[PDB]
Design a protein around this ligand. Structure first.
Ligand code: 9VE
Ligand code: MG
Ligand code: ZN
Length: 336
């Protein structure tokens, strides 16, 4: 009955259960969850999140339909891609789960909005080929042609996550009302489209203008009046979870950095063999891993998370302290 307890099959139930004590914490170790779940971290963590939040009961999803859909989704993440594989998706889903329960956001979101955000996080990189939108554009990929060069992969992650609902015994949304399905689909599209880094500067600028005029209860909880403000917060939340690696404990962050660099270098080798110019950050002969992380934190991660932390103050205090310390550590590790 480990299938009834967990998403999944494992003989080391005690160890998996110990890791999952941290389900609601930023300090969860998703590498260990993967080790104790026969490398099904996405199925295992999603089943745990849905049990924890009572989402199967709320939306009348049988455990069989949910497990079937998650196993199929996880199968459609490529295990030969070094970073954008189901461990990443599992991490983003679990990080989203933690951020939804930030105290400044208590009682703000409906159950449909919670369901939408965790599902968007789970599907947001499905069927990633391990090369960038600009690679696909530069090689005249059918995917780039079909979406007119715009949010190429992100459009494709949506198309695959939604198509898999149509597989036998996979429709996790079968018992939502018609209107609830229409609203969830729109929300999920908005959140997955907001993971395209080409949109980051405009997302952040909007988020800042939102912090400027936020309303807060005594208790310090945010009042988010309308739909438009709620989906703005949710698009940024999923984006923050996608950009969360450098805010994790250093031992986790180092493992994420090893993986994104291996995936970049494998792209650069494909470029080189094709007689193409090698994309920035993808030439293993010239990369400076530690310099590059400091830049990434200074120009992208830290401005995003300081703004997020302003919105949910003081909830993200420890996240910012960890981020700053990891920045200093990587800078200190620049060779010479
Ligand atoms: C193959 N190429 C090189 C590309 O695709 C690429 C080329 C030009 C621009 C961009 S970019 O997306 O505008 N952009 C700018 C900064 C780095 C990167 C970024 O945010 O990347 C995320 C992952 C990511 C990607 Cl790839 C694509 N989208 O859409 C969204 C995301 Cl969320 C990430 C995560 C973790 C990282 O490290 C650690 F924390 F593990 C990490 O470190 C990167 C190394 C260089 C320091 C990077 C990507
Ligand atoms: Mg992506
Ligand atoms: Zn991602």
């Amino acid at each position: 009955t480990s299938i009834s307890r967990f998403g999944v099959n494992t003989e080391n139930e005690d160890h998996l259960a110990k890791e999952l004590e941290d389900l609601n914490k930023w300090g969860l170790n998703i590498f260990n969850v993967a080790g104790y779940s026969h490398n099904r971290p996405l199925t295992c963590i999603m089943y745990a999140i849905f049990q924890e939040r009572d989402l199967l009961k709320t939306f009348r999803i049988s455990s069989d339909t949910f497990i079937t859909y998650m196993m199929t989704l996880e199968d459609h993440y490529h295990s030969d891609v070094a970073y954008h594989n189901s461990l990443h998706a599992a991490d983003v889903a679990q990080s989203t789960h933690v951020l939804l329960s930030t105290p400044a956001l208590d009682a703000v979101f409906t159950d449909l909005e919670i369901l939408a955000a965790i599902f968007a996080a789970a599907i947001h990189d499905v069927d990633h080929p391990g090369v960038s939108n600009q690679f696909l554009i530069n090689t005249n990929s059918e995917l780039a042609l079909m979406y007119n060069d715009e949010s190429v992969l992100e459009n494709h992650h949506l198309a695959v996550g939604f198509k898999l609902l149509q597989e036998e015994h996979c429709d996790i949304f079968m018992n939502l009302t018609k209107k609830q399905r229409q609203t969830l689909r729109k929300m999920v599209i908005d959140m997955v489209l907001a993971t395209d880094m080409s949109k980051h500067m405009s997302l952040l600028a909007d988020l800042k203008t939102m912090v400027e005029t936020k309303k807060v209860t005594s208790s310090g909880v945010l009042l988010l009046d309308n739909y438009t403000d709620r989906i703005q917060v949710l698009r940024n939340m999923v984006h923050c979870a996608d950009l969360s690696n450098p805010t994790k404990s250093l031992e986790l962050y180092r493992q994420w950095t090893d993986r994104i660099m291996e995936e970049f270098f494998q792209q650069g080798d494909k470029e080189r063999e094709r007689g193409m110019e090698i994309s920035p950050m993808c030439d293993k002969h010239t990369a400076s891993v530690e310099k590059s992380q400091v830049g990434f934190i200074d120009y992208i991660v830290h401005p995003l998370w300081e703004t997020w932390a302003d919105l949910v103050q003081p909830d993200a205090q420890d996240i910012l302290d960890t981020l700053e310390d990891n920045r200093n550590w990587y800078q200190s590790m620049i060779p010479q």
